[PDB]
RNA sequence: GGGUGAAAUCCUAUAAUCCCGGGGGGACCGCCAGUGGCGAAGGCGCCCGGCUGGAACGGGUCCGACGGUGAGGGCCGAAGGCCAGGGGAGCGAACCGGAUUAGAUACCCGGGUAGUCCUGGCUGUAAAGGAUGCGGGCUAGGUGUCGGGCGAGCUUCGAGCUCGCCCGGUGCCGUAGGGAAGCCGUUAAGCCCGCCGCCUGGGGAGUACGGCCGCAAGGCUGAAACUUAAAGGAAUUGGCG
């Protein structure tokens, strides 16, 4: 109808430390609607690589300064059809679920994951799962929040979990599944 | 002939080590169910692991 | 009850998880109605 | 730039089908038909032709609107419900790139519980 | 929109189904998962910390027959139901409507009370089933697999991988032998030495009368007058769905 006839498109930004980039359009009437919705793209389309295309990231908005809507880090999450594929019949999976805080103050929630080359018994499971913890909160400390996160998405802590653990046992494919922030820093 | 079955014999030995940092010459056994140290220095001599320890000296015989 | 495997075999009669349920009706009627 | 896509949810179900065509975030929609809309009567709701009929009529509407491509979400009842998608879903991917849309990525996002809630029926089904 | 073999009752213009940003609320723990593990049976599956019970292996340790079975007594016992306090999302005996039908008090569809969940008690029942009570000795082999130990060989030196042997659990094919056969066969339904519980043609009948328990619903014990020639089991040839 013709009140369609009254909107107006706008840039979204990727945050600033994955370089600001646009990452699609979107219509609204007055800027403060578009104050809090979330857009979902993938890794390969920032610095874009064929291998992580099954990374995805979330982005939220928080600022309209005309015609450009800043966007703020939210999660990540690896897609359902591939870790779909690495848990088959005979290779023991290993879950952790923690809760972190970085220096600024950014509190989190991370989720790794490692899978064991056949099954193990579950006393040599619950060993991972401490290696697994006791290199993450070690790595949570002089790390910020915008070098966690940078970190966390490429693979550079789950290639180490791959080599503290294979030491109990060989595996094959560790890595990091799912975080998402619960706060930021009560000041500035 | 003579199966096990009928007089059952040990596995397990009577050995004759010899201490490293004492030079002392002890008799010891291959299963331990404690942690065997020496008579005069304290250095242990054999370990308590499930089985068999696993001997921390050099060995004179068999006995 | 004491009840016997040997008719819950349903060839020659009815089901006896349902002649149980109309025993026990009877047994209440010769209760109440004096049964004292 | 100039450049505007979109994202295009495919509900199916044994029991009819809806296509959606909103924005990059989904908080704005486009155009919305579902398999009721086209047919006339209750039974072939759900069959692939509808969905063929449904996923046209959408892309006519959003094309002219701005959009030029769409990336793809098909999607079940799951949650309590089946968790395989029906009959129409892949007919109206296959006829919504005919009417002149590109297509990016494509999944399925269907819901799947953890060990959730009960289903309907009761210790013996539906005994049809 | 929903639902069906096809429909209808129902929800929707006070803006539903569908998509997005948030606030609250109860129940359950998927894939990995395995004739795999643990327990006396009923049963037990997200992760981290605390207290606790039992079993297997290794053992020139200690005690010194302290054992088996067990009438009468005692504790444990799914689901459902009961008495008091809380809670209530999904599902739903009773109940209220839409259909199908010669009827339809039913199957099918849209709703729904008790219940299912938590704290304190009572009840003591199942195809509670391996339809196979428990301890000891002996009587060919072959082959998977879980736990411990031992001996070799590799190794990206890992709480790792492969092969052989001894002990204890869990499966299969199978000699002698047993059985009416189906089939069991060192985890016996084989040959021996023990102890306790039950059975005596089919119905009447798990009934009547008496007693003891339970708040009730109910549990446990339990005959006879009479009536009948078969009732049951394991396998063959056909006819049929
Ligand atoms: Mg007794
Ligand atoms: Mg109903
Ligand atoms: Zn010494």
Same mark, same amino acid.
């Given at each position: 109808?013709?009140?369609?006839?009254?909107?107006?498109?706008?840039?979204?930004?990727?945050?600033?430390?994955?370089?600001?980039?646009?990452?699609?359009?979107?219509?609204?009437?007055?800027?403060?609607?578009?104050?809090?919705?979330?857009?979902? *793209?993938?890794?390969?389309?920032?610095?874009?690589?064929?291998?992580?295309?099954?990374?995805?990231?979330?982005?939220?908005?928080?600022?309209?300064?005309?015609?450009?809507?800043?966007?703020?880090?939210?999660?990540?999450?690896?897609?359902?059809?591939?870790?779909?594929?690495? *848990?088959?019949?005979?290779?023991?999976?290993?879950?952790?679920?923690?809760?972190?805080?970085?220096?600024?103050?950014?509190?989190?929630?991370?989720?790794?994951?490692?899978?064991?080359?056949?099954?193990?018994?579950?006393?040599?499971?619950?060993?991972?799962?401490?290696?697994?913890?006791?290199?993450?909160?070690?790595?949570?400390?002089?790390?910020?929040?915008?070098?966690?996160?940078?970190?966390?998405?490429?693979?550079?802590?789950?290639?180490?979990?791959?080599?503290?653990?294979?030491?109990?046992?060989?595996?094959?494919?560790?890595?990091?599944?799912?975080?998402?922030?619960?706060?930021?820093?009560?000041?500035? | 002939?003579?199966?096990?079955?009928?007089?059952?014999?040990?596995?397990?030995?009577?050995?004759?080590?010899?201490?490293?940092?004492?030079?002392?010459?002890?008799?010891?056994?291959?299963?331990?169910?404690?942690?065997?140290?020496?008579?005069?220095?304290?250095?242990?001599?054999?370990?308590?692991?499930?089985?068999?320890?696993?001997?921390?000296?050099?060995?004179?015989?068999?006995? | 009850?004491?009840?016997?495997?040997?008719?819950?075999?349903?060839?020659?009669?009815?089901?006896?998880?349902?002649?149980?349920?109309?025993?026990?009706?009877?047994?209440?009627?010769?209760?109440?109605?004096?049964?004292? | 730039?100039?450049?505007?896509?979109?994202?295009?949810?495919?509900?199916?179900?044994?029991?009819?089908?809806?296509?959606?065509?909103?924005?990059?975030?989904?908080?704005?929609?486009?155009?919305?038909?579902?398999?009721?809309?086209?047919?006339?009567?209750?039974?072939?709701?759900?069959?692939?032709?509808?969905?063929?009929?449904?996923?046209?009529?959408?892309?006519?509407?959003?094309?002219?609107?701005?959009?030029?491509?769409?990336?793809?979400?098909?999607?079940?009842?799951?949650?309590?419900?089946?968790?395989?998608?029906?009959?129409?879903?892949?007919?109206?991917?296959?006829?919504?790139?005919?009417?002149?849309?590109?297509?990016?990525?494509?999944?399925?996002?269907?819901?799947?519980?953890?060990?959730?809630?009960?289903?309907?029926?009761?210790?013996?089904?539906?005994?049809?």
């Amino acid at each position: 109808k013709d009140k369609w006839k009254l909107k107006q498109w706008y840039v979204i930004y990727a945050p600033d430390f994955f370089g600001g980039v646009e990452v699609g359009l979107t219509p609204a009437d007055d800027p403060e609607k578009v104050l809090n919705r979330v857009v979902e *793209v993938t890794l390969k389309d920032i610095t874009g690589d064929f291998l992580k295309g099954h990374v995805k990231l979330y982005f939220q908005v928080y600022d309209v300064k005309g015609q450009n809507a800043y966007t703020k880090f939210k999660g990540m999450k690896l897609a359902r059809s591939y870790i779909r594929s690495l *848990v088959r019949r005979r290779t023991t999976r290993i879950d952790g679920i923690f809760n972190i805080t970085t220096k600024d103050g950014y509190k989190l929630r991370v989720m790794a994951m490692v899978i064991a080359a056949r099954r193990i018994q579950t006393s040599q499971e619950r060993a991972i799962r401490k290696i697994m913890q006791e290199i993450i909160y070690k790595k949570a400390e002089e790390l910020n929040f915008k070098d966690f996160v940078l970190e966390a998405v490429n693979g550079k802590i789950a290639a180490e979990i791959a080599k503290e653990a294979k030491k109990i046992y060989p595996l094959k494919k560790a890595e990091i599944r799912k975080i998402k922030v619960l706060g930021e820093p009560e000041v500035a | 002939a003579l199966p096990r079955n009928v007089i059952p014999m040990p596995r397990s030995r009577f050995l004759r080590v010899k201490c490293i940092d004492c030079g002392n010459e002890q008799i010891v056994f291959s299963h331990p169910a404690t942690r065997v140290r020496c008579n005069v220095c304290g250095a242990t001599l054999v370990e308590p692991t499930g089985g068999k320890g696993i001997i921390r000296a050099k060995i004179l015989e068999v006995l | 009850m004491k009840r016997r495997p040997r008719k819950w075999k349903k060839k020659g009669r009815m089901r006896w998880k349902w002649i149980k349920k109309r025993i026990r009706r009877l047994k209440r009627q010769r209760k109440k109605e004096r049964g004292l | 730039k100039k450049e505007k896509w979109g994202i295009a949810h495919i509900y199916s179900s044994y029991n009819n089908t809806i296509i959606h065509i909103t924005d990059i975030t989904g908080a704005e929609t486009i155009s919305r038909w579902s398999g009721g809309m086209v047919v006339k009567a209750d039974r072939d709701e759900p069959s692939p032709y509808a969905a063929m009929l449904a996923a046209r009529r959408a892309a006519e509407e959003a094309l002219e609107k701005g959009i030029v491509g769409v990336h793809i979400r098909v999607r079940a009842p799951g949650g309590s419900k089946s968790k395989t998608p029906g009959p129409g879903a892949q007919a109206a991917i296959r006829a919504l790139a005919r009417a002149g849309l590109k297509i990016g990525r494509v999944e399925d996002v269907t819901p799947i519980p953890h060990d959730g809630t009960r289903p309907k029926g009761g210790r013996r089904g539906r005994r049809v």
